[PDB]
């Protein structure tokens, strides 16, 4: 997998919507609770993501949020290639809701439980103690010099 | 250190912008919030720390940074509490592309985009976005 490729998936919990962006090559994630899966919120999410990483391609679930012209215009402004219906990360959702379960009682609000879960996902040593965490792998893959 | 950040408040069009600058690179993140609260600050710092390896944050000395919710976030994340060069710069950029968007929010994240991806200097230059990942990739050795 190439360095510029992300998967976007929504997940739902307690009646709220979590947008998740998974860096394919590394397994790094970031995520936010938004009110609902609208064009505006998706567009805003993508734009934040693309301001921080060098995002070339997005694979989406082709939900109606991604087919809106708001998102299309966000992706064109950022020069992101949007690839609707293209699969690959579904485990990513079951994993994330799992970690959210483990921290949920340390937060007043779900949204804080989601970020704590992101943090924990991104810092976990994958494959023993000789390994690298998702946050380490992304910076390794993306680094140009 | 790969791990030192400065966090700053900025006010325009009546809303508040929270700006984090990675000191060694000039890389920024920013979130637009209704008010400068302990809740939003903590939340912002938690997003920040889930993404980058944040060790120390330098802050103005507002009460938003000293609530117990911020200290619990900073204790949980292992963060220690303690240039305007990339702050006047953010303001400048928001104003050059502001017309391109209705909501302040959206121009803020456009301006963060533009700032993080702008190559500094000629051929041989780097963007702030590249400097941060290079600095941290180097440090992971």
């Amino acid at each position: 997998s190439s360095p510029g490729i992300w998967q976007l998936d929504c997940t739902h919990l307690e009646g709220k919507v979590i947008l998740v962006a998974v860096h394919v090559a590394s397994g790094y994630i970031e995520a936010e609770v938004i009110p609902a899966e609208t064009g505006q919120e998706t567009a805003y999410f993508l734009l934040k993501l693309a301001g921080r990483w060098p995002v070339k391609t997005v694979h989406t679930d082709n939900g109606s949020n991604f087919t809106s012209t708001t998102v299309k215009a966000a992706c064109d402004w950022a020069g992101i290639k949007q690839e609707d219906g293209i699969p690959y990360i579904e485990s990513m959702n079951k994993e994330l809701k799992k970690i959210i379960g483990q921290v949920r009682d340390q937060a007043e609000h779900l949204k804080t439980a989601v970020q704590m879960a992101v943090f924990i996902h991104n810092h976990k040593r994958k494959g023993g103690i000789g390994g690298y965490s998702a946050g380490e792998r992304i910076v390794d893959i993306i680094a140009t010099d | 250190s790969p791990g030192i950040w400065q966090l700053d408040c900025t006010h325009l069009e009546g809303k508040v912008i929270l700006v984090a600058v990675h000191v060694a690179s000039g890389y920024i993140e920013a979130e637009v919030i209704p008010a400068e609260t302990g809740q939003e600050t903590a939340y912002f710092l938690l997003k920040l720390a889930g993404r980058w390896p944040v060790k120390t944050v330098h802050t103005d000395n507002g009460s938003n940074f000293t609530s117990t919710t911020v200290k619990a976030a900073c204790d949980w994340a292992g963060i220690k509490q303690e240039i305007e060069s990339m702050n006047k710069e953010l303001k400048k950029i928001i104003g050059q592309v502001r017309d391109q968007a209705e909501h302040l929010k959206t121009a803020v994240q456009m301006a963060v985009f533009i700032h993080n991806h702008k190559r500094k200097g000629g051929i041989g230059g780097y963007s702030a976005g590249e400097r941060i990942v290079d600095i941290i990739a180097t440090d992971i050795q």
């Binding site: 505006q40 708001t70 402004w77 | 968007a101 209705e102 929010k105 959206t106 456009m110």
Partner: peptide, 6 residues
Amino acid sequence: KXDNPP
């Protein structure tokens, strides 16, 4: 456009 067309 950029958040609400044009």
